[PDB]
Structure 1
Amino acid sequence: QFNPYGDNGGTILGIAGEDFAVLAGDTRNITDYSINSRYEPKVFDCGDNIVMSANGFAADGDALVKRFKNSVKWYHFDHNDKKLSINSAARNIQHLLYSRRFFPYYVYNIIAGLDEDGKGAVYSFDPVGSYQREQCRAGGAAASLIMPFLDNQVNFKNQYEPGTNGKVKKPLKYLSVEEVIKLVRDSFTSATERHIQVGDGLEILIVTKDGVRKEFYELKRD
């Protein structure tokens, strides 16, 4: 029997700062136990200072991104070159996903950018369209490895202030872009070690008011 779905591996990671956002993902593409490519970009600049990654089944992921990029294009045509806000893009993507409620896009989607107040924004989706705005999210193969680390190191969960002994929590101080990129690189280095589908390369897209910037880092190729 024909199986229309597949698993191309990979893992993605979105973190929202105070005035910036990052969307990272490894560049490895796989089927079963084989490597297809060591460098196959997974995170895309979709325009209007929005970045997107659809991780899981690459064919569905490429189709969704392709459709959203198209949705942005037609938003400009239909609404006098108005900028598509991150919240409006998220809602639009929900409807793209739910159009296939009975033959789903087999992807975990994340978008990142800035909200209308200039603050960092990350939005997260499930394969059928449920979405929500988040501060931190890992998606894909090694999502369960990385998320707990982010709960601990980004939202300071289970961390208290010494001397008080569990009476006073660690205060939620914001993170700089330099500090966030460290957590991203360490997250992927750790995931590369313990997950066989993660490795080869890491591509990070950083979003500020100035635009979209890229950073690439090598990962282990085993």
Structure 2
Amino acid sequence: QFNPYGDNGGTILGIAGEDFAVLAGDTRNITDYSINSRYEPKVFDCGDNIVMSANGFAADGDALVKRFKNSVKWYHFDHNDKKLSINSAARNIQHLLYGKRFFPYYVHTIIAGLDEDGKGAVYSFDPVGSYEREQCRAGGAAASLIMPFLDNQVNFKNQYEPGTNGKVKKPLKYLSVEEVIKLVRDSFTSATERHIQVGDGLEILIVTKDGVRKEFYELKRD
């Protein structure tokens, strides 16, 4: 029987800073045990300082991104070129996703940008439209490997202040864009070692008030 879904592998990662936000993702596209492409981008600049990735089944991810990009375009037409806030885009994507509640987009969606106060924002979605704002979120095949590491290094979970008898937690603080990119790179090289669907390359999209910048890094090709 015809199965309309597939798994194109890959994994994505979105971290939010104080005055910036990053959305990273490997560039490997796969089916079963074969490699389709070593460089097939899946993190996109959608306009209005919003970056987006829909990881999972690539056909659904491409369609969703394509629809949201088009949603941004029509928001400008209908509302006097108003800028689409990250929170408004999130709610719009919920409606795009839930509109197919009974034939879902098989994707884990993450968007990143800046909120209306200029602070970094990351939103993650399930396949049918439940969403939540977060400081940190990994998605895709190797999310299980990466995410507990982020909890430990970004949000400082399980780390207590030395000498305090495990009474005083290690204090939360914003990381620099440089420290974040280190965690991203180390997250993806670790995932590349232990996950077969993760590798080839890593593309990071950084978002500041100045605009959207890209950064690319090689990964192991085995």
Shorter-normalised TM range: over 0.9
1:136 corresponds to:
136
Deviations 1:68-125 (A, max 9, x none): 0000000000000000000000000000000100000000000000000000000000
Cα shift readout 1:146-168 (whole Å, capped 9, x = no counterpart) = 11000000000000000112110
**CA RMSD, 1 decimal:** 0.3
How far the C-alpha of 1:137 sits from its partner, in A, is 0.1
In structure 2, how many angstroms separate the alpha carbons of the residues matched to 1:214 and 1:83?
22
Q: Deviations over 1:6-57 (max 9, x none)?
A: 0000000000000000000000000000000000001000000000000000
Question: Counterpart of 1:145 in 2: which secondary structure?
Answer: helix
How many Å apart are 1:58 and its aligned residue?
0.1
- CA apart distance, 1:194: 0.3
Aligned mates of 1:122, 1:150 — CA distance in 2 = 14
In the aligned structure 1, how far is the partner of 2:42 from the partner of 2:24? 9
Number of aligned pairs? Answer: 222
Shift in Å, 1:174: 1.2
Instruction: State the shift of 1:67 in Å.
Output: 0.1
Gaps of 5+ in 1: none
Distance 1:168 1:187 in 2: 27
Percent identical residues: 98
Cα distance in 1 between the residues matched to 2:42 and 2:202: 10
Q: CA deviation at 1:65?
A: 0.1
Deviations 1:179-217 (A, max 9, x none): 000000000000000000000000000000000000000
Secondary structure of 1:60's match? helix
1:173: how far off?
A: 1.7
User: 3-state DSSP class of the match of 2:91?
Assistant: helix
Could you tell me which residue of structure 2 aligns to residue 186 of structure 1?
Answer: 186
Measure, in 1, the Cα distance between the counterparts of 2:149 and 2:80.
43
5+ unaligned residues in a row in structure 2: which ranges? none
